[PDB]
Amino acid sequence: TTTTGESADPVTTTVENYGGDTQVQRRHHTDVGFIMDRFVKINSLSPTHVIDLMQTHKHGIVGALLRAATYYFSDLEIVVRHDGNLTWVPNGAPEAALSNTSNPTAYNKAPFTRLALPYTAPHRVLATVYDGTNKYSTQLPASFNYGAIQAQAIHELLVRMKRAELYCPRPLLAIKVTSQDRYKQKIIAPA
């Protein structure tokens, strides 16, 4: 098929053009809500930690995919391996509140704590990139977070996006290829 390409109108040809038969597709694994729904780890940690999905690694399946969207929304689940008790506080809270027990506080139970937390930002949607001239009264507004946690020590933090919604796609890149033809690597095979 030939078309006026300058218009940018989508064109999808099929093998029928030269005698083939287009087949059946099952696209469950490329479903946004499904694919974002798995735990991902946050590497940097500290006794006091503000939950920010952008601390996710840029090349991990979740972090790559999240960054391939401009705006997003989701609820959250967290797994925290910590010493002592864990206190969570919602978006907008004074850092000092983290010391108070009446905020959701999970008492230590081995081996870690799994929790379901609601979206809690004052915005209708959040962004992975924000073109602010400043945004004050490569930096993101401080209001873009899912609250904060505190314990005597935070050893590990996994985070899971629930009911994820993604808007306005952005570039997603594969590994840079050096070889003359294909990027080759060791694929699993029996001994």
Partner: protein, 49 residues
Amino acid sequence: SGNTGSIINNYYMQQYQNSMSTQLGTQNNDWFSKLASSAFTGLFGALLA
């Protein structure tokens, strides 16, 4: 949903398990699905098969 495969109904109420969405006016506001389905599939011009 997406990646939840439990048969049994949840022990906790929905207003606890999740944040509650509000509206001003989940519908078919799927821009990219529309965009993709609108793609031209024919053949511009005359055919000789």
